Design a protein around this ligand. Structure first.
Ligand SMILES: CC(C)(COP(=O)(O)OP(=O)(O)OC[C@H]1O[C@@H](n2cnc3c(N)ncnc32)[C@H](O)[C@@H]1OP(=O)(O)O)[C@@H](O)C(=O)NCCC(=O)NCCSC(=O)c1ccccc1
Ligand SMILES: CC(C)(COP(=O)(O)OP(=O)(O)OC[C@H]1O[C@@H](n2cnc3c(N)ncnc32)[C@H](O)[C@@H]1OP(=O)(O)O)[C@@H](O)C(=O)NCCC(=O)NCCSC(=O)c1ccccc1
Lengths: 378, 379
């Protein structure tokens, strides 16, 4: 009786930023049009990004009202927090209402709430704010995951699994929401990492309902969460770093991140599937939701696992249409996979396959995997 | 087969601040000796604090080097974080080594880590840093609880229970560590709440090992974690608020917090025990670890539950000797209770009693309770 995903909902801010237009926007609104060297580099990064558009809360009017946000290193955490501590729970609410609708049960039936964000921090937290917005029972059992980073879309499934399986009848609402206003920085030739985040990072929220023992013909499972594993990739502490500072949430990204992922993927996949089956796996027999931290990460997974053409289509589709939204992204990918599987008349939510995996990748470097089974479409 | 607490260790910074000396220290080092108005108020708060001493990482030299820390509202987050992001995992390490020693198993048997702190935030987090310091397996399954606040000493037991019970053979290291350097603020009559935190808040770390199915040749359970409940007290959102700002971690404390706790304690205790056996009265039959957010909270729990003289001795002892260290405090209280029970020749780690409760109280206001059973002290 494993925990099952019973619903997935998603949301994004309303403002669409097409990648073709973003270099012009960024350099204009941050008053850096004279930095033609930085512009050419940013153009090359955007060309390689495999991201066509992103949704962002941030607007030009907000930058005009708060120019410290684009003035590299200026004190600006307070204004960023004033925005994100409100907008993160609100975007989470939208996704949650969609998940709850799909699930089809009353909000009063939710017993547990997991809220995850790397975009803000406050006491009481986003979980408390979401309880107020949704009218959740005031005695819901909460887990508030602040500042974990991009592996957490897998981690929250692992946590939901344990809560759902160890508490008879529990129904866990899981909400991941990101608003990257807190991570927006201006341009300096001394901190080129910012060009990569400026090209890739995006806003979005996901919500998932998890429960064990779904009610036959009443709840409709989408995926089963079978087993999970979290690990730290050796010698990679510098891979992804983010610090909570007076200037906002500052970050550093090593160019070696993709190679670290590629150098460990066989191992972490093997060790994960050992928790289920003693037989060796054929990686092409699986469906995949891979956190698309950037396009090179996706390429490394494909290469080192020997994946066939098109195996990572759902992952690449989400990166293209939404960018890297952090923890929610792998949930967008599972939703996309389910929806494409319906479109194509596949027999299961996992592209017609039985077994699959979610791969979250973030600071440490830390990788969390969740082994899934699909469910029948009919 | 419920999750058991198999070990408890604790640690504090080395610098001891006796409460009798703290007003003089605070007003001198923050250059506020002219504020005799605030000194009078602070003396009254310290007299009522029921706190005899506290351990603090912060020193006068740090304040002299970083006077923005005591300049109310000045930018200082970065220097605070530079301190706490290092000191929090280090203090946690000290507590963890003590817990691991008691537990008696190799560190390689630890499968899960929960780290909790409200004193800092970073990516990678304190959990990652503690893994490095201790040499935990790189594949430990982690939960990093940042900025939950004062209910979390109960919450982490609830989380550890689910992880330990759902993952067969799991052994969960739980570390809660607080360094209040991030919360230290200077003095203004526009934010009098700071006088309360200045009197009560303190530094410390706890470590607890949690597992189901204890290994008879090695492990010795102290408590069993039976059932847990978390709830929000109505109409109390202003009770405890803390914001992460350029000036550090700012906080507000409503004077009505004790009244909210007293007005809800019978209800939250009753609803908690509904998960066990339906207990509704005769609360003196239990042992207690109550988060001593301040002395008035302790007094309200005692009064409204009708607790007899001495029932909350362990709670009051920890408040007296350590102050309010945040989430770890209820674990210090369980450790004290175990210690005193040994000293007195009690039959169990819970003052001879069978059933007890941990009560954590923090922002929301949120109350998390954990119902415990004690374990035999063998003889
Ligand atoms: C799309 C890129 C960035 C570039 O495409 P490629 O196929 O590699 O093509 P190229 O080799 O032509 O490179 C083009 C130019 O880019 C430059 N450059 C590249 N990397 C860097 C770098 N780190 N730092 C500085 N510069 C860099 C490179 O030098 C070159 O410069 P030139 O043209 O010669 O002047 C790809 O490497 C990728 O997906 N990387 C993974 C991103 C990643 O780690 N994501 C996950 C972590 S996100 C996270 O945890 C988080 C999320 C939210 C908040 C907080 C935290
Ligand atoms: C020990 C006290 C503070 C005072 O003893 P009592 O028996 O009440 O004696 P009195 O009534 O004579 O009061 C003396 C004077 O103090 C004053 N005053 C009192 N309260 C306040 C106040 N809020 N705000 C401003 N002033 C206040 C009061 O007005 C009086 O002033 P005067 O003398 O007339 O000029 C007791 O009320 C207590 O335990 N409170 C619970 C503290 C609490 O909520 N803890 C939990 C949250 S910790 C947390 O979440 C956290 C932890 C770490 C980091 C971040 C967050």
């Amino acid at each position: 009786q494993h925990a099952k995903i019973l619903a997935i909902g998603t949301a994004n801010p309303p403002n669409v930023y097409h990648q073709k237009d973003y270099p012009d926007f960024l350099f204009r609104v941050t008053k850096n049009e004279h930095r033609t060297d930085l512009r050419e580099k940013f153009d090359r990064i955007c060309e390689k990004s495999r991201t066509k558009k992103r949704y962002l809360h941030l607007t030009e009017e907000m930058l005009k009202a708060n120019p410290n946000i684009y003035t590299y290193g200026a004190p600006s955490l307070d204004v960023r927090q004033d925005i994100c501590n409100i907008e993160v729970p609100k975007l989470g609410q939208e996704a949650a209402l969609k998940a709850i609708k799909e699930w089809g049960q009353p909000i009063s039936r939710i017993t547990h709430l997991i809220f995850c964000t790397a975009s803000c921090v406050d006491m009481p937290g986003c979980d408390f704010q979401l309880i107020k917005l949704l009218g959740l029972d005031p005695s819901v059992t909460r887990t508030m995951i602040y500042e974990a980073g991009c592996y957490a879309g897998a981690t929250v499934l692992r946590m939901a699994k344990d809560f759902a399986e160890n508490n008879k009848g529990a129904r866990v609402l899981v909400v991941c929401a990101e608003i990257t206003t807190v991570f927006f920085h201006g341009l300096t030739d001394t901190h080129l990492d910012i060009l990569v985040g400026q090209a890739l990072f995006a806003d979005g929220a996901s919500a998932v309902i998890v429960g064990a023992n779904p009610e036959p013909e009443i709840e409709r499972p989408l995926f089963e969460i079978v087993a999970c594993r979290q690990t730290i990739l050796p010698n990679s502490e510098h891979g992804v770093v983010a610090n909570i500072r007076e200037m906002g949430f500052n970050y550093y990204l090593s160019g070696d991140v993709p190679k670290f992922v590629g150098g460990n993927v066989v191992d972490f996949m093997t060790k994960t599937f050992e928790k289920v089956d003693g037989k060796k796996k054929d990686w092409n027999s699986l469906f995949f939701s891979v956190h698309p931290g950037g396009p090179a990460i996706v390429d490394q997974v494909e290469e080192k696992l020997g994946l066939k053409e098109g195996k990572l289509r759902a992952t690449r589709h989400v990166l293209s249409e939404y960018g890297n939204m952090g923890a929610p992204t792998v949930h967008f990918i599972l939703d996309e996979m389910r929806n494409k599987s319906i479109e194509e008349g596949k027999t299961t939510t996992g592209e017609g396959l039985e077994w699959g995996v979610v791969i979250g990748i973030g600071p440490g470097l830390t990788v969390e995997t969740a082994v899934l089974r699909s469910e029948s479409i009919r």
